[PDB]
Nucleic acid binder design. Structure first.
Ligand SMILES: [Zn+2]
Length: 353
DNA sequence: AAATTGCCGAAGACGA
DNA sequence: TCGTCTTCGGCAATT
């Protein structure tokens, strides 16, 4: 119900004072790390790309989780697709002229060699600061590479990335289906921007996975079919509101069933990816009228349920990369989430209060 | 030679 | 329903 849902969105609004505090802590530590990394021959060309919910303005409840990408401008990359996985590649170069040659294993760029020096440099620099601790972010395949905890309150996931300015790989050719929503001219402009490669095992070599975090952020902050969508109060859509509610639904279910582990692998990236597909299905701003919040939220819920039931959630940029494949998420986990979402919807989402 | 810096203003919280 | 205030993405000017 649009009124229950509005009340939920109000309780989810971030406090401006907390934003100021958290951003001050995060920026101070991040600036410290970039300064250090720029002094190193290997990470000379590093730069900051802020990613994810906080910088997309769909962070809910508290600004206590930040995603950060340290991207390296590298000479022209030559990619070799790993197996036929569409998203995972070996990185080669087209060595005297490049500072990453210390990480070559033959012609192949070693993600783990690069990750190891990156983590070592950050871990040493984090001891040089106070109220900040490193954790080597589990496996994660390598991305994020490290997780910082600042004064036991704010988490910073740091991802190492390579920036390529070459044309996007062929597996993206049919992705980013925004032509009838954001326009063909905007799709052409986005695909002229760089793409990123982050260190990531495929189910286990020296592979990198394609990343488009910067495009996802650009779409979210310029998200209407109308150029003026959300710029003035009389043209406010409920797109970001629906994404926030989807994220809260998943977060609340993962907390509710934290002792059962079925929901551990579902992520905000899944919810955001599904949301972009609903945007492609509903391209007009009038299909996201603020008066229709309950209806629009239900489109998001329904599409997400169809993804779970069919075990199919395409990466928005790489359509043959299935985020919900059996290899990645057990059927029983998808089944359990379906059951709980259907229950919640049938009972006016008790998990929201 | 090329990485750093300061400024702009849109986005979004918030109080009258 | 407004003005106000703070943060962040981009880049010319700076160094
Ligand atoms: Zn809008």
């Amino acid at each position: 119900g649009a009124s229950k849902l509005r009340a939920v969105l109000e309780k989810l609004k971030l406090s401006r004072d907390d934003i100021s505090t958290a951003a001050g802590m995060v920026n101070g530590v991040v600036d410290h790390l970039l300064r250090r990394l720029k002094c190193d021959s290997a990470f000379r060309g590093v730069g900051l790309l802020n990613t994810g919910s906080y910088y997309e303005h769909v962070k809910i409840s508290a600004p206590n989780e930040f995603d950060v990408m340290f991207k390296l401008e590298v000479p022209r990359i030559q990619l070799e697709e790993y197996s036929n996985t569409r998203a995972y590649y070996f990185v080669k170069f087209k060595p005297k002229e490049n500072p990453l040659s210390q990480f070559l294993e033959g012609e192949i760029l070693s993600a783990s060699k690069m990750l190891s020096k990156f983590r070592k440099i950050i871990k040493e620099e984090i001891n040089d600061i106070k109220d900040t601790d490193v954790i080597m972010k589990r496996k994660r395949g390598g991305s994020p590479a490290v997780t910082l905890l600042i004064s036991e309150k704010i988490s910073v996931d740091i991802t190492l990335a390579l920036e390529s300015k070459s044309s996007w790989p062929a597996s993206t050719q049919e992705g980013l289906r925004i032509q009838n929503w954001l326009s063909a001219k905007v799709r052409k402009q986005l695909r002229l921007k760089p793409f990123y490669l982050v260190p990531k095992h495929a189910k286990q070599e020296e592979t990198w996975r394609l990343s488009f975090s910067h495009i996802e952020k650009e779409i979210l902050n310029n998200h209407g079919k109308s150029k003026t969508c959300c710029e003035n109060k009389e043209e406010k859509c409920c797109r970001k509101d629906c994404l926030k509610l989807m994220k809260y639904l998943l977060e609340q279910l993962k907390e509710r069933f934290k002792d059962k582990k079925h929901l551990d692998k579902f992520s905000s990236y899944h919810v955001k990816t599904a949301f972009f597909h609903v945007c492609t299905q509903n391209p007009q701003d009038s299909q996201w009228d603020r008066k229709d919040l309950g209806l629009c939220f239900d489109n998001c819920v329904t599409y997400f349920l169809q993804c779970l039931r069919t075990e199919k959630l395409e990466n928005y940029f790489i359509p043959e990369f299935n985020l919900f494949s059996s290899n990645l998420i057990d059927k029983r986990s998808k089944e359990f989430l379906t059951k709980q979402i259907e229950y919640e919807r049938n009972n006016e989402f008790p998990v929201f209060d």
